[PDB]
Every structure is written in C-alpha cells, then in structure tokens.
C-alpha cells in the first residue's frame, strides 16, 4: 500500500527524513511513498521544514510507521460431498492469532461469518464460499471452497399391484 | 486403489507448512500440517518445505502407496437342481 505523510506547518520547502537517514525533499505538504522506493521503509519518520529565509525549524517529534507483512494463505474446505437437502460445515486452517471471515461471494461484502469452522445450512447444489484471514490488520488474498452436493438417489423399483390366493 | 488418504507431517516450533505436487515446488497443494488426499489410484507422491523464520528447511518427498485391486472371487458356473 502506499505509505502517506503529511504536515500541516507552513514552509516553503518540506524535508522528510526517513528511519535509515535517507532524505528527500518536496514542496507539499504531503508525501506519498510509492512501495518500490528506498524510502518506503518501517520505524520512526522525522520532519523538518524551511521557509524562505533559508531556515530550518527544529525536527518534529518522530512518527512511527509500521509496515505490516502479507499473511500466507490458511488451507480451506469442507466436510466433503453433503446429500442434497442435508446440512454441511466449512473448515479453515489454523494460523497464529488471526481473524477469519467468510464471504458468500468472491466480492467480500456479504459476510456470512467469523468463526474458525461454520456450519452451512440445506445445501442442494454446490454453493461456494469464500475465506479471508487477517493479521494485524492485513487480509491475506482469498480462498475459495466448493461444497459439492451429490446427487439425488433414486427411487427404487417394486413390482406393480399383485394379487396372490390364500 | 480408488479410495482416500491422508498426509502427515512432524509438528516443529511455529513454522509454516507447504505442500507441492511436484518437487519443483511451483504447484501448491496445500498449507495444512497433515492435509488430506483425494482419489488415490497410483502412488502418487508429494513433497513438504518447512518455514521458519522465512526460511525454508530443504525438501522433502513422501510416497502414498496404493494397494493392488482386489481380485474378483470365483463362483461355479450357472447350474441348476431338481426341487
């Protein structure tokens, strides 16, 4: 993501001083940090600014910036084939301290639940279901699962109406 | 031959697991500690990488072996017999 900073001080010019000594310059007031640049680096970020006499104002008091790793993917699926009409459950790998959240589509704004392993209730064809997992914030991509439904038996096959004797 | 399985792996300190279908571990298979397999027929095989600290521990390849099919039992040939 990018990496935003932002002043509100007056300048002329605005200096940004990076955890590791970098430093670069801009005439705005804010900064936006593209993530293939030096400068998108974690740890405590300082600003000064100069104004048109040439002067430098004492350095502000650092902002910490924290850039937060992209969770692994948790394994996802099922109990396997459900008989159509009957009850099914999903099941998601556990990973360290995370949230999880199930989606009823793959556009994840209908949310169907938060638990580790929901139930799903009457399936009669193969509804899909969709996994996020969280960490510290970051959702990590997205995992789809079918559940397949089988078939349904057949009715099975008796002769017709008979008469027999005593 | 025809039926399910299961994979296992040893349990370490945190650790991430990954699973390939091939031992050019560009085709993952699953993230599980001890994933299930679907549908054995043949001796399939899978391999195992172990993360720790984002660094992976070599390789390592197990083999599920399928047993032979059952042979059909044998019956006398059709017959019949007075009442």
Same mark, same amino acid.
């Not at 009457?122 to 960490?135: A, H, K, P, R, W």
């Given at each position: $993501?990018?990496? !935003?900073?932002?002043? #509100?001080? +007056?300048?002329?010019?605005? *200096?940004?001083?990076? %955890?590791?000594? &970098? ?29 048109? $006499?040439?002067? !430098?104002?004492?350095? #502000?008091? +650092?902002?910490?910036?924290? *850039?937060?790793?992209? %969770?692994?993917? &948790? ?92």
């Amino acid at each position: $993501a990018d990496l !935003v900073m932002s002043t #509100s001080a +007056a300048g002329n010019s605005y *200096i940004w001083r990076a %955890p590791n000594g &970098a430093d670069t310059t801009t005439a705005s007031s804010t900064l936006t940090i593209v993530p293939t640049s030096s400068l998108y680096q974690s740890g405590n970020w300082t600003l000064s600014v100069v104004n048109a $006499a040439g002067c !430098v104002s004492p350095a #502000s008091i +650092a902002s910490a910036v924290e *850039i937060n790793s992209i %969770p692994s993917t &948790a394994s996802a699926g099922n109990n396997g084939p459900v008989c159509t009409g009957t009850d099914a459950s999903l099941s998601a790998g556990t990973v360290s301290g995370a949230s999880y959240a199930w989606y009823t589509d793959a556009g994840t704004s209908n949310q169907f639940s938060t638990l580790q392993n929901p139930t799903v209730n009457n399936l009669t064809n193969d509804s899909t279901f969709y996994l996020l997992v969280t960490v510290n914030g970051c959702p990590s991509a997205l995992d789809s699962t079918t559940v397949v439904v089988y078939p349904l038996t057949p009715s099975p096959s008796l002769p017709a109406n008979f008469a027999v004797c005593e």
